[model samples]
Target: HWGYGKHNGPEHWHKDFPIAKGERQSPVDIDTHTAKYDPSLKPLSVSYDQATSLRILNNGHAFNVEFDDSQDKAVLKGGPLDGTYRLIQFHFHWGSLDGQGSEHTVDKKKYAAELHLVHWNTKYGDFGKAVQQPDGLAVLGIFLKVGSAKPGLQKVVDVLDSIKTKGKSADFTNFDPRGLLPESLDYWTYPGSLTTPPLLECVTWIVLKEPISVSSEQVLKFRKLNFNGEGEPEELMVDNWRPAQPLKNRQIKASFK
Candidate 1:
């Protein structure tokens, strides 16, 4: 199966998923110097007002917090998006230690981790159908660097121990995803893919320039997770990030000058 392992990771993905080597493949390395500043790009409009968090679970890859998108309860609009996008889920990618983890890098510099808040275009109806269109999905990526503790994430960190193995989950209850956002929403927007297989080329990446702070111990808690399921040799789920892909014909647009 396609994974982050040396046997099946990114370098080997193009074999099974031909689109992995496509023109708009994701997690592009941001060349700030070349990134054009667009004066017309709108500031992101995000509201997780009713933010009903369904559950948090380990999907044998990275654990994610599922959200209810039946209605327009939590939505993201503007910022390179034509229609309103409903928030469906959010997840993280991290490293074994703390030096490098984020898929998208800034001037080739890697962040400790990255957060992806995935959304689907409302007009597409659902994620399944949306994934096929060029403007189907919008993923907001926020960089996470080691610093002080973020009380906002303590509830999420608390449940990590219970879900130490793959296919594990727990009731995530209610949570406003806003707390995970950085102070400024200034970002670089570009056309890219899902970063992971099937490496679908239907994503508009909105990556924030500013990073949020998370304590070292809090980040280490994420390492306790096992990529393998129960009864199998415990394989820690770390360094689960994909590397930056070649930026072919696409241009990176910045919301700030």
Candidate 2:
């Protein structure tokens, strides 16, 4: 039951998962001035079939839009990745309020929220096995800002009412994830780990520089989601983001100047 609560928070994760203290842990602050500019980086290639989106589930940790990664139906290539990485699921991290929530920051500035599209390198076959290897996962990070209503996100927000409690899920399909991305593919790349448990240092992070907008009302609905099960005392799911970890000796590479 690891959560953002005082007892089982990120500080206590290392007690159960040793790698939680790993050097390459994710959600680091991206200092643009220090990031190395690499012109050799290729344009990101994303081919996600709308039908590949299966269902949306409230995993008690976060509400994820799961995809059918059994095939290369939806995959990410190029941009800081060695080979094709199949899309497994996409989830989000947010704060209780608008000022702070994103796991990764830029120049110590926090965004309203953050979105993560989880992908696993096909070289190791399934996500389960890939998660153990060094070049296994490739996560795309997109920051969210409060502004105009994002028509693209309405489909996802529409279902939050049904899945208000943890463990609740519904059949979700025909959702094109490309609509969620910003216009600019310009990004910062780095080597990092999952912000969650078992914090394996297997992810090649490609964090977008531009942020997309979501209406304030939409963000409020996100806070209504319960972290606990239906019968348990309702605990609103907010501030579910992990704090940015130390960068140590790792360097961040930028695709654009």
Candidate 3:
């Protein structure tokens, strides 16, 4: 019952964490059939390097990896996105099975998982303080599905064994997360908010329409994560994703015709 009961789940989240009640809750359903958007949205630049200093924080519900700014190697270029937004950290949200976990929904269809590539707006100076400004954030949302085996994710899944327990993290050098991005840079753009608490309302979301494939085994590995602390033993953090919220007045834009 550690913060995961039925009535005590997300509906009751705002009580203890007021930020949970923010205006822009993520993982909404996208209507792909009627999606209207620019025909040429693409990454501005793409670069990757082995990160030297990476720290994984157990942010209550999920894993948050904060990389050293000096090792900001992977950068997305082009698209409707012009300026450079340094990649700060990346995390995931998943379900019990590869059939039903996704932060953002498209026409009421949920994928197996969702990966958020968080970036801070350089216009605000640094990542630490940029979150305070309305235009201070941009997140690239990549939906992961369970399908054919993918060897590229082995590097990431390998680290899961070390951080098996809650609040547990380790430092690793020479690991590049850029391999995870899909080869097709095309994407769907929209004005959205943070999926988590304080649900900041200033985020410009770029959700990839074509989901990347990860084998069933990779998904199984993701289900093993926990949110508890080291000394507190292990509690399954499976199904950490929040249910889809209403779209409200936001419009979903596509990067293609």
lDDT of 2: 0.92
lDDT of 3 by residue, 76-105 (tens): 546655576677788888888767878888
Give lDDT per model, in order: 0.91, 0.92, 0.72
Candidate 3's C-alpha runs over 4 A off are 1-8, 16-23, 39-44, 49-53, 70-72, 231-234
Candidates sorted by TM-score, best first = 1, 2, 3
* Residues 8-92, model 1: lDDT tens digits: 8788999999998899998989999999999889878988777888999998889999998899988999989998999999999
| TM-score, prediction 2 | 0.98
Off by over 4 Å in 2: none
For model 2 the local lDDT of residue 177 reads 92
Which residue pairs in model 1 clash with each other?
none
List the candidates ranked by lDDT, beginning with the highest. Answer: 2, 1, 3
In Å, residue 223's CA in model 2 sits off its true spot by 0.5
Which of the two, 1 or 3, has more TM-score?
Answer: 1
Error of 2 at 139 (Å): 0.3
* Superposition error at 146 for model 1 (Å): 0.4
Q: Compare the candidates by lDDT and give the number of the best one.
A: 2
- Residue 141's lDDT in candidate 1: 98
Q: Which 10 consecutive positions of candidate 2 have the poorest summed lDDT?
A: 42-51
Please identify which of the two predictions, 1 or 2, would achieve the higher lDDT against the true structure. 2
By summed lDDT, the worst window of 10 consecutive residues in model 1 runs over 42-51
